[PDB]
Design a protein around this nucleic acid. Structure first.
Lengths: 119, 51, 96, 74, 50
RNA sequence: CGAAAUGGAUUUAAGUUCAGCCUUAUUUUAGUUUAAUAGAGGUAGAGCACUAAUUGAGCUAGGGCCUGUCAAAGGGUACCAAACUCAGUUAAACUCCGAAUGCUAUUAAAUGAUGAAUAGGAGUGAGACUAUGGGCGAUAAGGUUCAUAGUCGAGAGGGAAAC
RNA sequence: GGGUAGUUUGACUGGGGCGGUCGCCUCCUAAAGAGUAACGGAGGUGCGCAAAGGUUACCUUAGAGUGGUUGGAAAUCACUCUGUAAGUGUAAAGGCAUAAGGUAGCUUAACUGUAAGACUGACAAGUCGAACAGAUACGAAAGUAGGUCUUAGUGAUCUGGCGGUGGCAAGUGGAAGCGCCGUCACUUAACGAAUAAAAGGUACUCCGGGGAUAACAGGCUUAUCCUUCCCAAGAGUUCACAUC
RNA sequence: CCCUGGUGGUUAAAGAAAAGAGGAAACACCUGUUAUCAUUCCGAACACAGAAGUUAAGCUCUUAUUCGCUGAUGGUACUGCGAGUUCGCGGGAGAGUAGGUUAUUGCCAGGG
């Protein structure tokens, strides 16, 4: 009850502070946010001048058939990079979205980095 | 119990900075990485007298 | 009784008089308007043509206005812009 | 038995300097205050002493959200 | 008269164009003139220009 | 054509200086009053959610008294009473709320040298009273000291018996 | 060394003197922009901090109720309700859940040359400031950092001292000295500071003026004083009003 | 299009508590600490490795408005102005009351 509620509340507070520390995204340099469920891994690129998701990816996508490991998110970030290049976006701001930059997120971000995306 | 000290660039000896420091609290020899405008480069500055 | 402004404000330094090198300014536009080709713009001619007064004898040449006439110069100082323009027009410069 | 007190500081001239709807150019001071009586919205910045200033030319506007006032340049 | 009246009301009357007693001015009633007349109703006499 | 008796500073308080106010000349052209629309208050008022004051009931710790009480574990509560409930009140330095005016911006009318800048030249820097909002005093004083407006000051005439 | 000479010994002040006060900050007075007096009503202050700074990351009290060796109303711990009343070096106010609160790691931006555009303002001053260059600190990066959550912790000019730079160098060349940059020494607290250096009396007094300022009176007010009146609990054997 | 998850805008409680409904997908709880990480101790949170199980909880929907929040129309307080004076004109609360309120919406992904 209260313990789960306060865990949620802490996550929201962290999320909000992160958001206004990094600022909003613009069509030139939009914002990349992630979400880490118990099963999957989601990423979205958002332009807040419109509230529009320019691109997105997740491990649910059957064709990718990745898992939920460091290796899998490495490959997933590769796929995201190749999907964004054809829409000619190279600057992104990395909203860690209430998580700690470590492990899976670290591998995801570095994989976007080795392939010419400015985060 | 607070004295006005001067931070001196190590490699030139210029008294680049002046600051305040409390004696009788540390009586150490405060060192600070400060930017030495003669060299256009940061470096080490040590505590020293004023007069 | 308020401390006056010239006593609130501080001072700035000496005046360096008694050691100034003071001397007359003559401009290229003036030379163009007053002279012609071939003569020596110098102390004597500027004095008689009333571009300076014979109190000062260390003329400097500055570059206001434009000069078109080939002339010879015997002066004491010259600005870089003015001597560039004058060499370009094709005159000659001796520093005295 | 004289007065024990009688002591006052200099008035600091706080308050809103440009009214909502006025046209300002970059760098204008909008509010002088102690503390975020008014918070910062789009296109404004907060000084080290909570002054509100305009990052770009525009028209001042005040909004209210959950009872807090926000200043913006639109 | 304008003597002794409030400063604001003297300014309103001079904005209507009346400086003395016996001053005659024709005006077209819109919201502005209506507001000025309401401010200074006690010092004016309104007749209508057929 | 037309003041000031205000502000700032001062071995200043009967002085003097700067600003403001005034005038001459030139240049410049948008004061001010509304209406519409768009802004920020905590004043009046109101109120008890917050900080405090405080009334009658309900309820109840705790403390004291009494009662089969050794200073152990018990009970009666005429009381001293935290907290709590209902009802009703006080606050310039309390405000969960909040005007009317005033202030500020834009536009359209309306009013015609009222604005601003530069240059030249002063004077003033002792105010008083009335209609309001105040503080101090004794919700006393033609009292003292602030804010708005008017008058006298610098304004003749008519009226309030003279004033 | 007052034998003798030249001078100083403040102002505000509901007369003056005595007393008290003089810079700055917070709130009210202050009449809902700002500003706005008083010898109006309340406080703090002439610092502290090498972290109590900067950056990144991670977290939330106080109180009420309940259960626990000391441990009781209250120390520490668990949970429910409450949701900032807790806490922010230091006074108070305005603010602070994204916490500006708390903890931990790294670190010195507690930088240099600067600055578009402003607020406040008689002036002198004071404050905010995007952004640019160099050098960094932190973070993966975006970004932040030009001290302290903000608002008091302060002092002009002149003179003198120290360090750096090498402009000035009285015939020339050195040097002295000075300028420039960095910077120290004033309870100058009467704090926009008249001197580097300062106490009293004058009823023996004098001069220039003021009802702008006291004492005797005029005038205003009535605190105070005095003279009444309204209510009648009682006393008066009983009977509020014979009387008090 | 809809359910779910994630992400914006529109700020009126878009609030908590109690009761009922589900869980395909999705989400969450849940498994182990052994790999990098975190704790002023503690896989609680976080970190990493996975899918045995569930609606119990979180979440979604439906509920009496039980608590809160919001709020009429009038009237009053107060206020601008006035040769009408306890009035004439203009503006108009707070509180209380009749009520109302457990949002709405832009676009990304999975499939009904």
């Amino acid at each position: 009850m209260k313990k789960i509620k306060e865990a949620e509340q802490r996550k929201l507070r962290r999320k909000k502070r992160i958001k206004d520390k990094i600022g909003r995204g613009v069509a030139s340099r939009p914002r990349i946010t992630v979400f880490k469920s118990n099963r999957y891994f989601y990423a979205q690129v958002i332009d807040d001048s419109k509230g529009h998701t320019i691109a997105s990816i997740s491990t649910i996508e059957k064709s990718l058939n990745l898992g939920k490991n460091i290796d899998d998110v490495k490959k997933l970030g590769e796929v995201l990079a190749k999907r964004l290049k054809e829409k000619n976006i190279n600057n992104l701001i990395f909203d860690r979205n209430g998580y700690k930059y470590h492990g899976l997120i670290a591998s995801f971000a570095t994989s976007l980095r080795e392939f010419g995306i400015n985060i | 119990a607070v004295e006005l000290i001067s931070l001196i660039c190590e490699e030139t000896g210029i008294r680049n900075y002046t600051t305040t420091k409390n004696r009788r609290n540390k009586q150490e020899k405060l060192e600070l990485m400060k930017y030495c405008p003669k060299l256009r480069k940061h470096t080490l500055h040590k505590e020293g007298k004023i007069k | 009784g308020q401390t006056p402004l010239y006593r609130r404000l501080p001072r700035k330094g000496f005046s360096n008089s008694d050691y100034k090198l003071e001397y007359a300014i003559v401009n290229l536009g003036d030379i163009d308007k007053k002279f012609k080709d071939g003569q020596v713009v110098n102390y004597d001619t500027l004095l008689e043509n009333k571009l300076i007064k014979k109190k000062n004898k260390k003329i400097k040449i500055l570059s206001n206005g434009k000069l078109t006439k080939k002339v010879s110069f015997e002066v004491s100082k010259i600005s870089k812009s003015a001597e560039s323009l004058v060499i370009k027009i094709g005159c000659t410069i001796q520093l005295v | 038995g004289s007065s024990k007190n009688g002591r006052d500081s200099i008035s600091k001239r706080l308050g809103v300097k440009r009214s909502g709807g006025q046209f300002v150019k970059a760098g204008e001071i909008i509010v002088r205050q102690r503390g975020t009586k008014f918070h910062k919205g789009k296109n404004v910045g907060l000084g080290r002493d909570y002054t509100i200033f305009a990052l770009s030319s525009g028209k001042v506007e005040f909004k209210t959200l959950k009872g807090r006032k926000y200043v913006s340049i639109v | 008269s304008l003597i002794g009246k409030l400063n604001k009301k003297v300014k309103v009357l001079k904005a209507l164009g009346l400086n003395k007693i016996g001053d005659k001015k024709v005006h077209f009633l819109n919201e502005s003139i209506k507001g000025m007349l309401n401010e200074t109703i006690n010092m004016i006499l309104l007749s209508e220009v057929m």
